[PDB]
Amino acid sequence: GVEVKNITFKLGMYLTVGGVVNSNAKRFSINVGESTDSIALHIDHRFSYGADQNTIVLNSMVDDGWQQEQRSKNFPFTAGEHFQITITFDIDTFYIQLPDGHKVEFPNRHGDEAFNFIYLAGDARLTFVRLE
Amino acid sequence: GVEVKNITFKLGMYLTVGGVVNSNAKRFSINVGESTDSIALHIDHRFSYGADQNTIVLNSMVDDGWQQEQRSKNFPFTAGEHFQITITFDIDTFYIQLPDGHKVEFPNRHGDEAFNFIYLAGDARLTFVRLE
Numbered sequence A, B: 001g002v003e004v005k006n007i008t009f010k011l012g013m014y015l016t017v018g019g020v021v022n023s024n025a026k027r028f029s030i031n032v033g034e035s036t037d038s039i040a041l042h043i044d045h046r047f048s049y050g051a052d053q054n055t056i057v058l059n060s061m062v063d064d065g066w067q068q069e070q071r072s073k074n075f076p077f078t079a080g081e082h083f084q085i086t087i088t089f090d091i092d093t094f095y096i097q098l099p100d101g102h103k104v105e106f107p108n109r110h111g112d113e114a115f116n117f118i119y120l121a122g123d124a125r126l127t128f129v130r131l132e
């Protein structure tokens, strides 16, 4: 998927990602961190991934190893349709605004103040990234 | 600055890049191609870079070697202020729409139907990328 590197996404900023879910999507993720092996925030939108049907799975990855999962069954996503998601954070917590007023919080496990890497993976097409 | 890798920019698509020019900018470039070293379209916005004052320099880079330059004196950019440009192409030509709505042309020297890499260099910061 699309990898955005050498950006500065730090305290007090927001990041919005727009995309269109593919027609027969299985899943797509948005990822914020340092690299494909260091991810502070993985938001996996699972349409049908094993036992996870219309479920968001959140995690972090450290040295290419997945940590402890969190799940949400609020799933305002539809195959073939546009979405926007907005992320902000402080040293404690990521705040994720999903479509249709849904919201998920996920811990900022290392208390990082800035990230340099954003990555959209799987069954969605990027339409835009806005960061300020 | 920002590198965007594995972006799918094909014939028929419009790539818009937006951001803010540094307050005492000397130059910044938007680059479309395959990597830092492999650029089909380099658009260098030169406020002040040697003999180029308020000049756009366009070129391509093959295997880390610059090719033949082209210049334009249409320069609707201001240090410290926002900018946005929209890039399109067919198999022959790139079309670059500047902030005042006017277009500059540059040859598609390799006659490619898709590119996969964008990056910004220099005295500006990216705040937005869109594909439509």
Ligand SMILES: OC[C@H]1O[C@@H](O[C@H]2[C@H](O)[C@@H](O)[C@H](O)O[C@@H]2CO)[C@H](O)[C@@H](O)[C@H]1O
Binding pocket: A042, A044, A057, A058, A059, A066, A069
């Ligand atoms: O945690 C995100 C990570 O999940 C992996 O799949 C997990 C699965 O979610 C879980 O239920 C099972 O117990 O373990 C699997 C392997 O850790 C995905 O493979 C990976 O791509 C991420 O999405």
Ligand SMILES: OC[C@H]1O[C@@H](O[C@H]2[C@H](O)[C@@H](O)[C@H](O)O[C@@H]2CO)[C@H](O)[C@@H](O)[C@H]1O
Binding pocket: B042, B044, B057, B058, B059, B066, B067, B069
């Ligand atoms: O061609 C784009 C390339 O230009 C380099 O600068 C050139 C300059 O434009 C030219 O007038 C002079 O003769 O040579 C310089 C060095 O080749 C930039 O340094 C490079 O970053 C690109 O912008």
